[PDB]
Design a protein around this ligand. Structure first.
Ligand SMILES: [Cl-]
Ligand SMILES: [Cl-]
Ligand SMILES: [Cl-]
Length: 340
């Protein structure tokens, strides 16, 4: 049958569910990476093999290749880099099980800059999309406008991004009649948008400090701007977020578990989030959603979600990856594992 058809799908996914790991991390431009990425990429409850890893980074380390090399080395030879992209120091890397490269369309990327901050600094989005068998996926990572009082600007970051991301292009929309011209996130079966959205907890440092003294997370989240704005429909229309059971992932003193003890007294906040949307209700099942407290090189902790996503058979008359991946990186990862 077709490379991307029902027979192949049966061989590789009898239950038609794909295991996806999606993470976002703001690195604060740090030069030295954590000693081990094992706790980042293989979290404790990730007690089963992931099919796809998608890693979005904001304020990324200058040596993008070294970061990708360490990811490749940690995942090991069962995974290959299906795609990676950069828009300034905003990065995204997509690693997939090597036997699954055959079922992917060509991978397409797009970028949007939503705010010029200075001559050398901007905020924006990086989107990567491809079809897997017959099901299309769109991954967007973003760094939104910063500041407690800048919700209105964050709304504009959302709107500018869904209006401007030029995806898909060569690879056909899988359900075009369902698509809207004004929102790129309507053009795909499964959408994940993860980043430093910079939404904060309202109420001020003193009130949030009081709440953090067991922590009642639900009560804490009553102060979250992002849940508030999503609830009234002003942002991320059609998206959901998994339940949060972890503590705020920002702002931390470097290398420590204490929240910003400088005079600026930034209110601990859930700046880093993973959101999902699907064309078909129920296609995406969150399995776990958490931060990685052991990664402490940056003022932000990484945040990741594990998901199970439904996939459907496809056809071969689209532009195909057909075994295309970063072979040089793959070899570098092999080389590093021989060394260590
Ligand atoms: Cl960035
Ligand atoms: Cl573009
Ligand atoms: Cl900003």
């Amino acid at each position: 049958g077709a490379l991307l058809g029902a027979d192949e799908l049966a061989r590789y996914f009898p239950d038609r569910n794909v295991a996806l790991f999606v993470a976002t991390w703001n690195m604060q431009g740090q030069k030295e990476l954590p000693p081990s990425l094992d706790e980042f990429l293989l979290p404790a409850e990730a007690d089963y093999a992931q099919d796809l890893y998608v890693i979005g980074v904001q304020e990324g380390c200058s040596d993008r290749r070294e970061w990708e090399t360490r990811l490749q080395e940690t995942l090991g030879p069962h995974y290959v880099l299906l795609s990676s992209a950069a828009h300034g120091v905003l990065y995204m890397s997509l690693f997939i099980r090597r036997d699954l490269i055959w079922f992917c369309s060509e991978v397409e990327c797009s970028t949007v800059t939503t705010r010029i901050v200075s001559q050398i600094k901007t905020k924006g989005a990086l989107g990567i999309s491809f079809t897997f068998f017959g099901t299309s996926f769109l991954f967007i990572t973003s760094h939104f406008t910063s500041g407690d009082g800048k919700v209105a600007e964050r709304l504009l970051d959302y709107t500018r991004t869904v209006q401007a991301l030029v995806l898909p292009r060569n690879v056909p929309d899988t359900n075009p009649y369902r698509s809207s011209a004004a929102d790129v996130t309507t053009r795909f079966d499964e959408v994940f948008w993860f980043g430093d959205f910079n939404f904060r907890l309202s109420g001020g440092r003193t009130v949030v400090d009081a709440l953090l003294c067991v922590v009642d997370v639900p009560a804490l989240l009553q102060h979250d701007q992002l849940i508030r704005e999503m609830r009234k429909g002003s942002i991320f229309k059609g998206f959901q977020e998994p339940d949060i059971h972890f503590l705020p992932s920002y702002k931390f003193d470097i290398g420590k578990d204490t929240y910003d003890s400088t005079s600026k007294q930034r209110t601990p906040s859930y700046t880093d989030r993973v959101l999902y949307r699907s064309r078909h209700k129920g296609d995406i099942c969150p399995v776990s959603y958490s931060s990685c407290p052991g990664i402490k090189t940056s003022d932000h902790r990484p945040v990741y979600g594990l998901f199970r996503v439904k996939v459907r058979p496809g056809r071969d008359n689209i532009p195909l990856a057909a075994g295309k991946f970063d072979r040089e990186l793959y070899l570098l990862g092999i080389k590093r594992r021989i060394s260590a």
